[PDB]
Design brief:
The PDB classes it as photosynthesis. The entry lists the keywords Photosystem II, photosynthesis. The structure is cut from a larger assembly and holds 9 protein chains of 9 kinds. By secondary structure, chain C is mainly alpha-helical. Helices cover about 35% and strands about 5% of the residues of chain C. Chain C is globular, with a radius of gyration of 14 Å. Classes of the chains: A mainly alpha (about 80), B mainly alpha (about 35), C mainly alpha (about 140), D mainly alpha (about 40), E mainly alpha (about 30), F mainly alpha (about 35), G mainly alpha (about 450), H mainly alpha (about 100), I alpha+beta (about 500). The complex binds chlorophyll A (CLA) (6 copies), beta-carotene (4 copies), calcium ion (CA) (2 copies) and chloride ion (CL) (2 copies).
Chain lengths: ~80, ~35, ~140, ~40, ~30, ~35, ~450, ~100, ~500
Amino acid sequence: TTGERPFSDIITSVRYWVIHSITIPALFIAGWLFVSTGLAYDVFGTPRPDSYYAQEQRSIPLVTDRFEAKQQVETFLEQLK
Amino acid sequence: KLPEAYAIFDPLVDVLPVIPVLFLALAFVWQAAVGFR
Amino acid sequence: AELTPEVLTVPLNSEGKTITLTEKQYLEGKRLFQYACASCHVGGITKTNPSLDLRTETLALATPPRDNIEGLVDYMKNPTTYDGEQEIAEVHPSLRSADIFPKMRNLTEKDLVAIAGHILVEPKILGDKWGGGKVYY
Amino acid sequence: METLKITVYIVVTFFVLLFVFGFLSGDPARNPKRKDLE
Amino acid sequence: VIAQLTMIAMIGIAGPMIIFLLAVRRGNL
Amino acid sequence: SYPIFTVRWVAVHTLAVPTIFFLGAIAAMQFIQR
Amino acid sequence: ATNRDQESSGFAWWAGNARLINLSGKLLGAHVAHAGLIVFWAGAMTLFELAHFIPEKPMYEQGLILIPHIATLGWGVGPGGEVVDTFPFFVVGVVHLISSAVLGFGGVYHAIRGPETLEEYSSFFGYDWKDKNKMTTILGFHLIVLGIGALLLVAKAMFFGGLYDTWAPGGGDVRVITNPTLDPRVIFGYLLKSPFGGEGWIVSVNNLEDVVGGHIWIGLICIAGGIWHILTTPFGWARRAFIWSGEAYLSYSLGALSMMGFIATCFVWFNNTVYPSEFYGPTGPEASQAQAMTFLIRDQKLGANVGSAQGPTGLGKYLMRSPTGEIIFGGETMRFWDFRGPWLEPLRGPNGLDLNKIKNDIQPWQERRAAEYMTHAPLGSLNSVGGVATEINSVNFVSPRSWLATSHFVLAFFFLVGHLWHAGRARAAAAGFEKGIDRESEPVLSMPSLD
Amino acid sequence: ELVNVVDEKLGTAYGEKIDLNNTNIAAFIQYRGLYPTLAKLIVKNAPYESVEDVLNIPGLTERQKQILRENLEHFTVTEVETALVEGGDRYNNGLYK
Amino acid sequence: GLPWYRVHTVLINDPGRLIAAHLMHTALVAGWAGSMALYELATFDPSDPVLNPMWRQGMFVLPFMARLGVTGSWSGWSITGETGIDPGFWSFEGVALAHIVLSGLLFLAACWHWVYWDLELFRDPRTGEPALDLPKMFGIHLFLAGLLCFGFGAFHLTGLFGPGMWVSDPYGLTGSVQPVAPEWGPDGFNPYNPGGVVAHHIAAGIVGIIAGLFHILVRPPQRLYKALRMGNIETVLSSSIAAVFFAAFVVAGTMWYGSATTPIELFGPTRYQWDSSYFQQEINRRVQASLASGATLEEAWSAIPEKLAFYDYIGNNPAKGGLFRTGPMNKGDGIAQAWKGHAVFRNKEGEELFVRRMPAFFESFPVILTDKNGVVKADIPFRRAESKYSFEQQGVTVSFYGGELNGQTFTDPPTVKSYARKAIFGEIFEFDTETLNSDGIFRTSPRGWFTFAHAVFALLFFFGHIWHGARTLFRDVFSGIDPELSPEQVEWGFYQKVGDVTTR
Ligand code: CLA
Ligand code: CLA
Ligand code: CLA
Ligand code: CLA
Ligand code: CLA
Ligand code: CLA
Ligand SMILES: CC1=C(/C=C/C(C)=C/C=C/C(C)=C/C=C/C=C(C)/C=C/C=C(C)/C=C/C2=C(C)CCCC2(C)C)C(C)(C)CCC1
Ligand SMILES: CC1=C(/C=C/C(C)=C/C=C/C(C)=C/C=C/C=C(C)/C=C/C=C(C)/C=C/C2=C(C)CCCC2(C)C)C(C)(C)CCC1
Ligand SMILES: CC1=C(/C=C/C(C)=C/C=CC(/C)=C/C=C/C=C(C)/C=C/C=C(C)/C=C/C2=C(C)CCCC2(C)C)C(C)(C)CCC1
Ligand SMILES: CC1=C(/C=C/C(C)=C/C=C\C(C)=C\C=C\C=C(C)\C=C\C=C(C)\C=C\C2=C(C)CCCC2(C)C)C(C)(C)CCC1
Ligand SMILES: [Ca+2]
Ligand SMILES: [Ca+2]
Ligand SMILES: [Cl-]
Ligand SMILES: [Cl-]
């Protein structure tokens, strides 16, 4: 053995579950709210179900210029009215 | 659908077929409780 | 893009009248279409007769015209060949042939209206894909 | 073509009988340890 | 949907419950 | 008798807190309707 | 606790049930509790299917496998396989589910409470694997039980309402079988037929008279064999041929069940008599043939002379000859010319498909059936998206024939693996080297060198 | 000098209109009232020396004659091309969706 | 005895025979260079630098001779297409001969060092054992390399004492060997700037001299000597192999993307010039400028150089070849004879139509014509029965401007289609397919083959590096691990630090 506490002692202890009945659900809920508040979309720039196309358009907003790519994308986002 | 009188049991009936699988899972709970000796 | 009321607005008749379908109506239409029609009409084509599709222009050129709610409901009650000449209920699902096509048995008038609505709205969304077949998948 | 057919049928039968009577010929006893398995 | 999840939880718990009861009462596990 | 915060602890954690959160986000996602 | 650890039993937890080999009471427990699991599944699954059943939708559109089995027996259905009464399905499900409580009760009892071994309790129920006579006796009892079951099928068919006959004149219907085939030349004629194309061995059984008469034969054979084995002990040649142990018998049964599994796979894939397409959907062959039928009809309506229509390859676009000359559907469905189905047979003449009948005699019901089957071909994705692998999402469909064929091929295969595993192990253990080679007495070390 | 006759035929009226003597039957779906009844009679009674000859098909109703007259502007005739009419390709030309 | 794959290990403690072996290797490589140059001279047709330059002819070493200023033959021709030039001794032939002679002399030297392997020079004066002082050898060789690099930059490439290097216009039309001044500003690190190559060699040359002097004069730190096993020649093998696969990946890269040292007149155009339609853009620019100065369409297109048009053709794209499609590009599409001219497609309404070009990815490609805005107007249908866009329906015609076919118009659909099929490849050329029995299938250029060979070799040399690094660092255990290995060294929690026995 290497000197750290055995996993089975830790995860079979009361203290562990006292800590983690708090910490695990908290992280789970934080992730849930990361999605349900829509923040994930804003952080990563992922389209919501209503932001893939403008109402009438059927053309993909494909990036076509390396160095003005940022601007091209911003423009694509504006054309979503 | 089941006969009208039994309708209140639809949710139970929905879950019943899965029960045999839980028996296999039960074998492991049991074995975990005797430390897989 | 969104499923706007405008999109859900389709011709009710050949006389210039439209109806605006509700989102619930559209989803119901999709559901009933899947239920009764998609076995043959998946994506707007016709597997047992690919010469005839469900594109709006095609329905428009059928006799009587089928590019509207009333026409489609009628087709679902009393289907005809594309020229209107022979009645085909006997080899095509309809209320009239619900005895031999049992999935029509519980379709209501409201159901048929929903189906017709799905059929007219879908091409407004999917474009060439609807009735396009594998080329456009 | 019949002659080829008969020839093959006889050959196949011959080898199949070899296999079956062969495995019937005290096969469990043909091992390097415990022979009395009857 | 709530009735289904409730039946599942009762039936699903029943086994571990049997094991737990026997473990508590020094049963013939 | 045993230390609590080890290199092992750090490793376990950087693999664990993120996955818990991620799984919760995914589960949030399962209900999103177009 | 007797033997339930590795030190005492010699078996690890993952081979735990091997600890049961010589404990007839707990082993009986295991078997009875398991039978309980099987019956439980039949019941719960039946009730789930019924709860989910929309009676006007075709069964095969609804992911059903048990209700089609009940329906094939004539229960709950009328003309064209239409559901007239769902109550018999309910009865079957309920009664299975209730019986499973009983089997479960006895199983749990014998497994944890009852006598661990049965030999000191009773000389009738106790047994030694190595006791050949007792083995053939119990074997005999079970043979008699199975024979009785087959006669229960015969009874249902002949005296208690009949069976669903897809081939019934004027259309598929429940029919009482009054003249089962008893002629041994026909019955065992099936056993002697090629398993290859256009023959198909027992899978080719195409009428209920043959099925029923066959079950009369199987019933009597099984009862007679049961009596035989109760009244006899294994002959010398058999004694010298086999390994006589629990694991060996297990291996034999595993090989048998594997074989049966493969047979069932082929049965549900090709046979549309004991698996009526009204309930199970069209077979692959059936649906391909149905496509050819459908477009022959469409194009003929438009004015095509289908008998004289030359396809791109030189072969008839709609109709061609089989290798022995029969008129058959063309295109790729040329491979499926051995297909037979009630919707198609009226167009069949002495030389195969009859051009005059095709021109004049195709009924709207045939067109309907061909269209339905063509559009319910047994193709679909694992997530149950119906149609070819390139089809878009739309149709929630995987044919029951596919579920049952795939499932039973997987199970039959793993059961062949099980057979090899246990037959080999039983051989090694009987010979005494299943645990490895004796270092002081390694057989190869006493053999001459190969070169 | 070797020529692909179908491509060549696309340079004729065959490429602009429904050729009553050559075009596959599904083309009649393009206009109101032609498919399948009139389409069938037209293909069955081909070839025609002129477009207006379609009007002389036996057994036609007055309504049918009307539809045909209304759609003559959409029809043409060119020489029968064996490659397009053999094999029953006018009824099924191996094209679906 | 020794396994087959270890036969050369006999040289490890034999500096003289190792030197002999290196001499033999060098002799082999130089002999290869001479032979290759002679074969290429025996096969090379210098008669058309425009449509049959070296890179169409599968020439591999000829472009490298050309790159550094060898452009003439004793027979009187030059690769730039001049006549009556006197290249002096250093023609292609003189170079080949020189390499052959070098090869021979090296062979003889190899013989000498092999026979006389036991020189006192190779023995350590203290132990009397064979020994090479590798760090100092490194200093000496680094210094020498520095001097050579510097000299190469300052005299050869500058033209101060030497011919300079191959340079061209951005479209590879007027390439020649020229003196190049070093670029000392940041554009010297622009790969397409030759002056950067010169400044590189001067500066890196000086740095090599300095660092070499350092390594001659300053001994390695004991810690580095121990860590890198600097007494073991196989460490030198390991790091040299690493450096070499690095250099090989670099030259593969500059060959594929192009640089001032991989000119398109010597190695052919890049795939990217096709990808971005680089030459099409320049051609269109020149044509527009001609039209704006009052030229007719005919005049405007006739003013386009054949060489430029030839660059705008996919058969010269190095990404159109095949691994087993062997030999010169000419063996594929043929020996280019002439530009047919620019094809202009038009429909019956007179609208100009444009053929969709084949991307490098596609072995085959459909024929599709759109208007200026990308709307489809014509194509070659696969299925005809529902064709709407056939050339015949759309009355597609083609008119040629410039080249052999200047001023001609074709209207018969077979011919128009034929030219459209050729138009998918860009500008259209007449080829001699008979001379070489060309099979009509595109082959890659020397740019492609160079890139391939060097990327593969670099990748394999990564393995070489790994292997010899392993052998160096694990020399003590390569016949196997310690027979009396303590299970305590391997079980956990016995030493606080792994391997360390003084941490019990
Ligand atoms: C079909 C599934 C099946 C069955 C029927 C059995 C049968 C049995 N197992 Mg098991 N086993 C299985 C799967 C199964 N096994 C699997 C998958 C594994 C691997 C994890 C093992 C591993 C295993 C081992 C390692 C061992 C056994 C042994 C035993 C036997 C004694 C168990 C015991 O002592 O209970 C002790 C447990 C309890 C008292 C807890 C309660 C258990 C009961 C039966 C649960 C009943 C629940 C049910 C819902 C109640 C319904 C009642 C209602 C009808 C009124 C017993 C005959 C043992 C044996 O060989 O002994 C000689 C043994 O050592 N098995
Ligand atoms: C494979 C089936 C099977 C077998 C071989 C046994 C064997 C044994 N059981 Mg039993 N048992 C079983 C199933 C089985 N059990 C089930 C399902 C239950 C739950 C109801 C029980 C509950 C049970 C108890 C509670 C007890 C036993 C005990 C006994 C033993 C004495 C039985 C006797 O004396 O019968 C003599 C014969 C009769 C009493 C008449 C039998 C009447 C039968 C039921 C007529 C119907 C037969 C029909 C063909 C069954 C078809 C069922 C099919 C559809 C599945 C014996 C070892 C006893 C024991 O072990 O003592 C320590 C004991 O106390 N068993
Ligand atoms: C599950 C039911 C079952 C089981 C396990 C047994 C098992 C046993 N029976 Mg059998 N038996 C049964 C049912 C069963 N019987 C029935 C229903 C009957 C009445 C018809 C008989 C009649 C019977 C008799 C008359 C005899 C046995 C004998 C035996 C024993 C040796 C059998 C053996 O060697 O087979 C291996 C099979 C052979 C050696 C036959 C030849 C093998 C050929 C080449 C295989 C061909 C099949 C192939 C796979 C393809 C199938 C299709 C084919 C028909 C074309 C054995 C203990 C013998 C015994 O010792 O009695 C005490 C014996 O003489 N049994
Ligand atoms: C850097 C190395 C290199 C490069 C890039 C070229 C490139 C060029 N040379 Mg050249 N050549 C070379 C070395 C090289 N050669 C050498 C060393 C020789 C002496 C033999 C020649 C002799 C030569 C001649 C005689 C000719 C050329 C020609 C040409 C051109 C045609 C290329 C061709 O078709 O290759 C084809 C390449 C292949 C088919 C790839 C071979 C791949 C091998 C077989 C893989 C082996 C796999 C291996 C066995 C796997 C082991 C597995 C094991 C580890 C488990 C081309 C411009 C020709 C040209 O057109 O001149 C005008 C010409 O005629 N070359
Ligand atoms: C400068 C480059 C270089 C040098 C000097 C060495 C030197 C050495 N290598 Mg090493 N090696 C290299 C690159 C190099 N390697 C590379 C790039 C790799 C990865 C592919 C390897 C992989 C390697 C292995 C795996 C091993 C060595 C070993 C050896 C040593 C003995 C070689 C021998 O006896 O083979 C004798 C070789 C033959 C009798 C025939 C080889 C035939 C080859 C495979 C095909 C034909 C090659 C062709 C003639 C060469 C064309 C030139 C090429 C550059 C295009 C030796 C010290 C071995 C060693 O360490 O032993 C203890 C050893 O095991 N090398
Ligand atoms: C899988 C890759 C790999 C591996 C396993 C090795 C393993 C080995 N090499 Mg190394 N080596 C490698 C790649 C690798 N090398 C590369 C790519 C080079 C460049 C040519 C070298 C050059 C090299 C030399 C010169 C020497 C070794 C030696 C050694 C050995 C001692 C370990 C060492 O020195 O590490 C070296 C450390 C590394 C490979 C890690 C470098 C990490 C860099 C600095 C991170 C850079 C981040 C970057 C700046 C981010 C920007 C990215 C950009 C794209 C935007 C050992 C056998 C020595 C030897 O063999 O002794 C016996 C030795 O002398 N190697
Ligand atoms: C990129 C980014 C970066 C970094 C970040 C990171 C690092 C992240 C992390 C995090 C992570 C780390 C993630 C998490 C995870 C995982 C998941 C998402 C979950 C899960 C699970 C699962 C689902 C499992 C299941 C299954 C299998 C697999 C196994 C067994 C069986 C089962 C069925 C159970 C930074 C910021 C610097 C900057 C920029 C950007
Ligand atoms: C041995 C053991 C094993 C196994 C166990 C078992 C297998 C046993 C069994 C059996 C079973 C199988 C049990 C059970 C269940 C059953 C019951 C409990 C019955 C009842 C039913 C009900 C109650 C009914 C009601 C109904 C009505 C009638 C109508 C409709 C509706 C409803 C559904 C409600 C294990 C693995 C654990 C391990 C160890 C040992
Ligand atoms: C109901 C059915 C019917 C009838 C049935 C039948 C009558 C059948 C049968 C019976 C039988 C008759 C079956 C079988 C066969 C048997 C077996 C399965 C065999 C095997 C054998 C063994 C396994 C052996 C092994 C080995 C040998 C080879 C050699 C030596 C060693 C040993 C012995 C080990 C029909 C189809 C008409 C119709 C449908 C329904
Ligand atoms: C000695 C004498 C003489 C002579 C010299 C000589 C006569 C010369 C030479 C040299 C030579 C004339 C030889 C050589 C070279 C060649 C080689 C060395 C090559 C190799 C090859 C390689 C290695 C390749 C491989 C492979 C294959 C084959 C193909 C593909 C892939 C690869 C490429 C990888 C003199 C008068 C000078 C004087 C001095 C002395
Ligand atoms: Ca929505
Ligand atoms: Ca030729
Ligand atoms: Cl269409
Ligand atoms: Cl086909």
